[PDB]
Each structure stands twice: as structure tokens, then as C-alpha cells.
Amino acid sequence: VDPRLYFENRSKFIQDQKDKGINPYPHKFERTISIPEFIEKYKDLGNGEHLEDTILNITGRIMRVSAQKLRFFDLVGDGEKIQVLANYSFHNHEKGNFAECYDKIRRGDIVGIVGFPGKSKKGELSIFPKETILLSACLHMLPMKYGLKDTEIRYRQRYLDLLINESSRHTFVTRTKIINFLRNFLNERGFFEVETPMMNLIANARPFITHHNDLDLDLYLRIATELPLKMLIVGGIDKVYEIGKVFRNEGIDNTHNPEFTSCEFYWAYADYNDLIKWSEDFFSQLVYHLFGTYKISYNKDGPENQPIEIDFTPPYPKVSIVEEIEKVTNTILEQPFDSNETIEKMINIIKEHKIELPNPPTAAKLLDQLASHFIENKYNDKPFFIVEHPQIMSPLAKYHRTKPGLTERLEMFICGKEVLNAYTELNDPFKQKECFDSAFCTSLEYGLPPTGGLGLGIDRITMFLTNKNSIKDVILFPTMRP
Amino acid sequence: VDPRLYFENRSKFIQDQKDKGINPYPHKFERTISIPEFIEKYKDLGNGEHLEDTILNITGRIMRVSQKLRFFDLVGDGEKIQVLANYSFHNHEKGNFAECYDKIRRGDIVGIVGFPGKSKKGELSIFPKETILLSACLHMLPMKTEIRYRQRYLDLLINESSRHTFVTRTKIINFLRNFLNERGFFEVETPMMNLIANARPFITHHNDLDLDLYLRIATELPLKMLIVGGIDKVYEIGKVFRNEGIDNTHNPEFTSCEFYWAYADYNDLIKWSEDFFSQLVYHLFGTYKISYNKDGPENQPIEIDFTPPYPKVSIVEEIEKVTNTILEQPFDSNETIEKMINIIKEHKIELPNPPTAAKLLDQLASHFIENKYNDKPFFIVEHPQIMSPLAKYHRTKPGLTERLEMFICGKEVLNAYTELNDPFKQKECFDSAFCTSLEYGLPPTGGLGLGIDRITMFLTNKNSIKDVILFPTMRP
Ligand SMILES: COc1ccccc1Nc1ncnc(Nc2ccccc2S(=O)(=O)C(C)C)n1
Ligand SMILES: COc1ccccc1Nc1ncnc(Nc2ccccc2S(=O)(=O)C(C)C)n1
């Protein structure tokens, strides 16, 4: 049963129909209701009951074929399934022979059916055709479920995954509902959605580089939407956001894709508490909107293993990064976190605990590194915030009001993975180090109000809410090498 | 009045505030009401009426400044109230009244604690007891060039119509998303980069995969694979890229909407387009008739009527009923190409680059058809297959398709067709993944694309695409 032979026979079948005067790709079929409408309008009749008086025009993809005068098929459309019972008695022989009409049908063929609704003797909700027409033939062989488990066919040919595995469709439906909820959530709080250029002249992480033929200039794909949105705040759009793709030309892994979907907003006059409350409201309400409860289960170590429970009931713990690193390492990090003595202490903590060195070893990255190992996995039963990051890790963040060297920064984590970043912006142009992007400093001189900004990782959030371990399982067409 | 000096004086003023114990960029202000809420909650208040027992914390930007009685205009979220600073209502224990208000300049962001009222002249206003600077505008704000494009925040602060233009843009996209969702369409995202991408593409180097990728020019191919996948109504709104020449109606980065609709036919796509444009314009204007300065703000405007239905003109038939010249079936024949060139030559019409049969028919349609109906939208229909190799063949007219293209004032704004789903008629199958997916079964399907930027230009009465994009790209 070579797949190259099945295709060649089906290909010969198609030309045979054309020679015999039959179009296997007809122009138009006049559907009257969809399968989900069908299921909802006739699910509650009796076992074996027929309403032979109403005629309907249904479409769908034949998904399983079973065989003399009785023939059964499965019919799928818009994610839902009904049975097709082909009975010799109801067949309209003016249109053709019963046997050859249904013998030509293979699993995967898309068909139009003119029939009446009913329920089977065993009791299965079914459509009772009088005529069936091939609309589009499936020339290749569709696998069963097992074929798309360990192979990366799910990613190369995502349409096979969406036809064969029911979980795949639900995943990507949940993805769309997540984004719909985010947009409606933001819009109800008076936020204004905008579009910002994806190419600019100036652009942490390596950029994607491209050239514009017209202006003979090299351009950069955006790594974030921060700068243009802050200029709109100056412009008087006091609550503004954008949902869209950003690009970081770095290495692929399970939680990093070079092209990924970000939402960022800026909120004029928001303080740290406003941002904390927004995050807790958003996540707790999003999870309730999807699941009817605040508690979900997530297979933190794959489906081969027992899942853990994550509770999204607010409030969530807040952990101060510097104070907590000191707590679990019995160390006192100094006042200048970039001081040679303070660096030295941080570097020595890495070796004693045996941690991947962060060379280029920088105060920021070691701080990051320590947090990675010492704090970022502190809780897994519930989301939590790491807060009050030092000003040396957060050059754009307003300085903490009562603690020296710190900011009003917050980062929300789920199962050890960053999902949200937010802080109050440094708006004094005389205290921003960089201004001493050049458009940003000029925009600051026109007056930026006290302002809070927040960014969300849409792909990672969808990952946890659909119980997936890889970012590739929530992107329809993850980019790959041919 | 050197602008460098005004800046230098105000920056010296800032450092003078700090050296005085006053922070001109304080940490936070506890705003309790926005200006639009204030305008709405107290709109129905009598002249000279005050509510002195109600304390409010309001913010905004001073846009106008005019000894013991100070008057200011305060704007926020696009709306304005007046600030009436009376010596008697100031809290003198916080500072000298004159010292506080003499520092205020146009463009300053201020936080105010005070009570609401209307002036004896009727103007709705806030009466401060305390006014605090929240962020200084160190530069001189111009009163009402290409500065509007680079520093768009200046455009949004000084021109009221600019904010309205971009509010309408967001409103248009919102209406389209809701219009699609109510009909059962499902929004998705497809890659911005791909291995195969006519039009010149943008090229970029992927570091991790050591590959050179192409920025998408359309969303058509991945969306069609989703129809195969059983997502029968699907769409995407996002950016597509054409590495080509900038024009008043062409931007290399522009916003597209494409949907695919399994089992839709020509009539469905006609009716979708006619319902969408008419209902959208009515939703925005309360009428189907708008005015548009097609010839610039100097010249007089025309009226575009969006009352459906719109006329439909068959491209090949009409080009002969005006050129009186039959175009032989193989439109790409050397003979047919030469005859089309001859019409173009005899009418002093510019030969397109390159001189291909699809290009020539485009030129002939532009000059003999596309500007016939300009007081309402219209469709050009039944384009030859040579122009739309992905479209399905016309049911009865050989060599044609069932494609529809909608024009407004001579600019294309919408393109739709039923899809060629027989893989044995796809000449392009000699993009590799798409031919394979056609062999799994693509049902009969309608596709449709929308030019969001062009639509926004007509509905906000702009002649240039740069006026409907917040930050149009430009050389520095
Ligand atoms: C080569 O890929 C990359 C290289 C470098 C950065 C990102 C990516 N791609 C990627 N893909 C999916 N999710 C994320 N999220 C993320 C990543 C880093 C820091 C914070 C977050 S986040 O989720 O808190 C949100 C607030 C952005 N990044
Ligand atoms: C250098 O810029 C370009 C180079 C080449 C192509 C496009 C652009 N940019 C651009 N900018 C704004 N609107 C459009 N739309 C458009 C353009 C041409 C024909 C039809 C349409 S359309 O609106 O019917 C839509 C359904 C495609 N294209």
C-alpha cells in the first residue's frame, strides 16, 4: 500500500470521472445548514425516528468509511461530527447507481448531501442522503490518530493535525478566545488600540535586518512596541495598546520563538498598585472566562506524567528580588550592585551552587541568573510576582520611592516562566541615563506624564491555558528549516 | 525667540525647581476622575453654579494661559475644560498663589485638586485649591510640515482632526472584526516570514536557522491551508510587505484583511462586500452618502454614495464595447498582446512595465473602465484567468474567472474570487506546501482581501496614505 501508488490511482480516478462526463470538483453546492446547526436542531429525537419531510443540503468531510445495501460514513464540519447512513431505499436512482456512488467514496473526501435528518435504530444522530456528490477528493491517504504523535508532521502540515487530532483545534480556538478576551478587557477599561510600524531605522537582542529598495536604506524589524506607544502618550492617547508580532533574532527553544505575539499597553497616571491590580484582575478573570474556575491543571513535565494544579485566585504573592536572593543565600548584596566587591560576591555564589556562569558576566545577568535559579521557581501552585528589580536591570523604570537602587518593577511568573513585565516609566529626562531612541528623549522634553507600562507574552499564556509544553504547539505554522 | 533658548530657559527652570525643594516630576498623582467623565457628570450644571463641597483630583495638559484670578484651558483624552484659579479658593498654606501659577506654561501637564462648576459665562470648569506640575513641556508648543509625520505626538496635540482621523481608523477595524465574528469567522495568525515569497519581497537573515527569509506579501496561502484543515470561516488582519515604490495610495508596509469562506460563491462575495461597505459607512456617518476631496482640500468635493447595490462591469466585454476590438481567446498569444499594445499606442497610454497581457489589460481597464463610475463604488468582474491564476474558472464564459474587484474613486479597495481547487488545473503546481495541501481536498471556497489603509483614507477624507498611518516610515 505505497502512498505514491494510492495517489496515482486516485489521480487516475479523477481523470476517469472527467472522461466519463462527471466533474469531481463542481462549481457550487447550495448548503442549507452547517453541521453544528444540524446537531443543535435535531439532537433530541427518538431512537430510529426520521423526519423524512424536511430536505437539507449538508456539506462535510467523510472521515471514516465502512461497508451491502447499507453504508455508514462519518461526517465532520466545523469541528463536529454526525453519521451518514446511506440506505438503498432512500437513494434517488435517477441521479445514478447506489453502489458506484458510494463505492467511489474514500476517507477524506469532501461531499455535498441532499437528505433528511433522523436518528438511527441503535440511536446515532444521522443525515439520510438521497443524493451525494463529491465536492473535492482527498487524493492522499489520511493517517489515523497515531501517525501524528512523534513526527513533526503536525507542524509542517498543520491541516492534517487539525483534521485528525481533536485537541489541536481546541488549542487554537482557545488561543483566539484568549486574544479576544484581552482586547475586550482592555477596551472596556478605555484603552485605545493602535498600529505601530514593524520596521524602523534603529534597532539587547540582535535584530532582523532588511533593505528597502526604494529608499536604499537598511531597516530593522521591531523588537518591541515600547517607544512608539510612549510617544502616543505624549500625544495625549492616555491609554493605548497594540497586539502584534515582535521579532528577536535569537535562538529557538521551547519558550522562545524569534517571531512571537506581544501585547503592550501604556496607561497614563497609573502607579505600581494599578499595574498589580490590572494583572491580577486580567489573569483571574481570563481563567474564569475559559474554565469556570480559578484552578487549572498543567502537565509541567509532559503528558507522560501527573499534572500540577495552578490556582489563579487573586491576590498573588509578591517577592522582592534582591531581598529574597539574600534570604535564600545568607548573603548581603551591597548598595552599588555593580561594585567590584558586589560583583565578586555574586560571581562566587554561582560557583558554590555550581551554576552556569553568565559570561559575559554582568551584574544584571548574574542578578538575573541568581533569580533564575533561586527565585523564579519559588512557587508553582500559583502565579507570583518578582518585584522591585534594581535600576541597573531596568534602565527605563522609575526609581523606587523608599528603597535605594531599586525600581517599581513587577514580573509575573507561571511555573517558573516569565509571562508579564511592567513598571512605572522614568519620565524625568534629566534622570534618564541614555538621554544625555533619540526621538524618545526629544519626546520626553515635551512632557510625558507619570505612566505605567505592561507587556504580556501571549504565546506563553496560551501555552499554560492549553496544557502544552512547547511554544510550537500554540503557533499554527511555526517557522522551520525545509 | 530662539527655540534653543526657550528650551534652555525652561531646562534651567527645571533645575531651579529641584534646587528649591520642589520636584517638577513627582512620583504619582491620585487622579480620581478623567476630563471626559468630568464633562459628562457635570454638563448639566447651571451658570455660575459651583459644587464647593465636592473634591476632585483631575489631570491634564495646559494648552492656554491667560493677577489674583488665573484662567487656563486643560485638555485630556481629546476633550477640554477650563481652569479658574481664584485667590480665595487657593490653599495658601501649600504655597504662594502667584508663585504657583506664574510658573505654568502652555504644554505643562498638571495635577489639580479642586471642585467643579460653570463660569458665569457658562463654561464648564475646575476651580483649583491646589495645582501641581506633573511634567513640564520644555519646548515651545506651536499653535495650529513633515514634523506631523516624524513627531506625530505634536500633530495629535495641536490638530483636533488628527486624533479624530486615527479614532476613525480604530473604529473601522473594530467594525470589521465584529462584522466578521458575528458571521462565524474565526481570527488566526499566520507567519510574517516564509521561505517562498509578482512583487519584490523584503529579505532578512534568520540567525538561528542560517536562512534568508522573505517577509510575507499576502496571507493567502496559509489561510487556505486552514480551510483544508477544516476551519471553514477564517481570517487575518495584519501587516503585509511589498518592497516597492511609495505612493499616495501605496505603502511598502500596509495593513491587510483576508478571509476565506468555504462553500461561498460569487453572489455571496458580492453580497458580503455590499453589506459591509454600506453598513460600515452608515455606522460611521448615519447616512450612506459621504463627501470626499478627491482633488485636494483646495478644490471642491464630490459625493460618494454607498447605497447598495453597486454596478458590475465585465472587464473583457466592456473593453471591446469601448475599443471595438476583439481580444482573441489566448489572451497571452503573441497576436493578442500586440493588438492590446496597439490600442495603448493609438490612445497615447503608457505601456506598462513589463508589457505582459495581464499588465496591458490592467492598463486598459484603468483608462476605459476604472474611472467611469466615481460617484459610487463599483465592481470590475470576470477577469481572465491570465490575471488571476489562483481563481476558479468562470462557469460559462471560457477563459474567464468569477473574480470581483471593487473600486472607489478609481482606486481598488477589495479583491475577491472563488478558489481553483482542482490541483490538475493549477499551472503554478509544476508555495511547494500549498500544492500538496490542494491534493488533500480543498472544498469550494471564496476568498476576499481588503485594503484597510485605502478604506480609511476615503472615510477620513485624506488624499495620502501617510495621513492614516500613525508613524509612516521616512528617511532620517
Ligand atoms: C528567539 O526568541 C526570543 C528571543 C528573545 C526574546 C524573546 C524571544 N521569543 C519569545 N517567544 C515567546 N515568548 C517570549 N516571552 C518572553 C521572552 C523573554 C522575556 C520575556 C518574555 S514574556 O512572556 O514575559 C513577554 C512580556 C515578552 N519570547
Ligand atoms: C509600495 O507599496 C505597495 C507596493 C505594491 C503593492 C502594495 C503596496 N502598498 C499598499 N498600500 C496601501 N494599499 C495597498 N492596497 C492595494 C495596492 C495595490 C492594488 C490593490 C490594493 S487593495 O487595497 O485592493 C488590497 C486588496 C491589495 N497597497
- Strand line-up in the sheet with most strands of chain A: 6-10-11-18-17-16-15-14
Approximate strand percentage of chain A: 15-25%
CATH architectural grouping of the largest domain in chain A: 2-Layer Sandwich
Number of strands of chain A: 18
Highlighted features:
homodimer; ATP-binding (chain A); tRNA binding (chain A); alpha+beta; 482 residues; BirA Bifunctional Protein, domain 2; five-stranded mixed barrel
Structure description:
Two copies of one chain form a homodimer. With 482 residues, chain A is an alpha+beta fold. Chain A has two domains: 145 residues, Nucleic acid-binding proteins (OB fold (Dihydrolipoamide Acetyltransferase, E2P), Beta Barrel); 332 residues, Bira Bifunctional Protein, Domain 2 (BirA Bifunctional Protein, domain 2). Helix content of chain A is 30%, strand content 24%. Chain A contains 13 helices and 18 strands. In chain A, the strands form four sheets. In chain A, strands 6-10-11-18-17-16-15-14 form an eight-stranded mixed beta sheet, with helices on both faces. The first copy, chain A, has a five-stranded mixed beta barrel with strand order 1-2-3-5-4. Chain A has a three-stranded antiparallel beta sheet with strand order 7-9-8, with no helix packed on it. In chain A, strand 1 and strand 2 form a beta hairpin. The radius of gyration of chain A is 29 Å and the shape is elongated. The two termini of chain A are 27 Å apart. In chain A, 38% of the residues are buried. The complex binds the ligand COc1ccccc1Nc1ncnc(Nc2ccccc2S(=O)(=O)C(C)C)n1 (2 copies). One ligand JTR binds next to strand 11, strand 17, strand 18 and helix 13 of chain A. One copy of the ligand COc1ccccc1Nc1ncnc(Nc2ccccc2S(=O)(=O)C(C)C)n1 binds next to strand 11, strand 17, strand 18 and helix 13 of chain A. Chain B: Keywords: Aminoacyl-tRNA synthetase, ATP-binding, Ligase, Nucleotide-binding, Protein biosynthesis. Chain B: It is an enzyme of class 6 (ligase). Chain B: It catalyses: tRNA(Lys) + L-lysine + ATP = L-lysyl-tRNA(Lys) + AMP + diphosphate. Chain B: Its EC number is 6.1.1.6. Chain B: Belongs to the class-II aminoacyl-tRNA synthetase family.
